[PDB]
Design a protein around this motif. Structure first.
Motif, PDB file in Angstrom:
ATOM      1  N   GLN A  17       0.834  -1.178   0.000  1.00 56.89           N
ATOM      2  CA  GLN A  17       0.000   0.000   0.000  1.00 56.89           C
ATOM      3  C   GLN A  17       0.872   1.231   0.000  1.00 56.89           C
ATOM      4  O   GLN A  17       2.076   1.154   0.063  1.00 56.89           O
ATOM      5  CB  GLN A  17      -0.964   0.106   1.211  1.00 56.89           C
ATOM      6  N   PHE A  18       0.236   2.413  -0.122  1.00 56.28           N
ATOM      7  CA  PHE A  18       0.932   3.687  -0.110  1.00 56.28           C
ATOM      8  C   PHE A  18       1.504   3.937  -1.472  1.00 56.28           C
ATOM      9  O   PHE A  18       0.968   4.721  -2.251  1.00 56.28           O
ATOM     10  CB  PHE A  18       2.067   3.831   0.949  1.00 56.28           C
TER      11      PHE A  18
ATOM     12  N   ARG B 267      -3.115   3.582  -3.479  1.00 58.63           N
ATOM     13  CA  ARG B 267      -3.367   4.881  -2.917  1.00 58.63           C
ATOM     14  C   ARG B 267      -4.707   5.316  -3.415  1.00 58.63           C
ATOM     15  O   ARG B 267      -5.237   4.761  -4.376  1.00 58.63           O
ATOM     16  CB  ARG B 267      -2.306   5.934  -3.299  1.00 58.63           C
ATOM     17  N   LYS B 268      -5.293   6.335  -2.751  1.00 59.76           N
ATOM     18  CA  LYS B 268      -6.607   6.791  -3.131  1.00 59.76           C
ATOM     19  C   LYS B 268      -6.454   7.987  -4.017  1.00 59.76           C
ATOM     20  O   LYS B 268      -7.423   8.487  -4.584  1.00 59.76           O
ATOM     21  CB  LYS B 268      -7.451   7.213  -1.916  1.00 59.76           C
ATOM     22  N   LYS B 269      -5.214   8.474  -4.155  1.00 62.50           N
ATOM     23  CA  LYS B 269      -4.966   9.630  -4.983  1.00 62.50           C
ATOM     24  C   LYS B 269      -5.092   9.204  -6.455  1.00 62.50           C
ATOM     25  O   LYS B 269      -5.720   9.968  -7.239  1.00 62.50           O
ATOM     26  CB  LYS B 269      -3.563  10.232  -4.779  1.00 62.50           C
TER      27      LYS B 269
END
Length: 17
Positions: free
Chosen positions: A10-11, A15-17
């Motif tokens: 994750q990251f 990501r949600k971006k």
């Protein structure tokens, strides 16, 4: 102590971006 192999789930990877 650290959690980056999380990040290699994750990251950076997810990501949600």
């Amino acid at each position: 102590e650290m959690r980056l192999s999380a990040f290699f789930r994750q990251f950076i990877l997810q990501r949600k971006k």
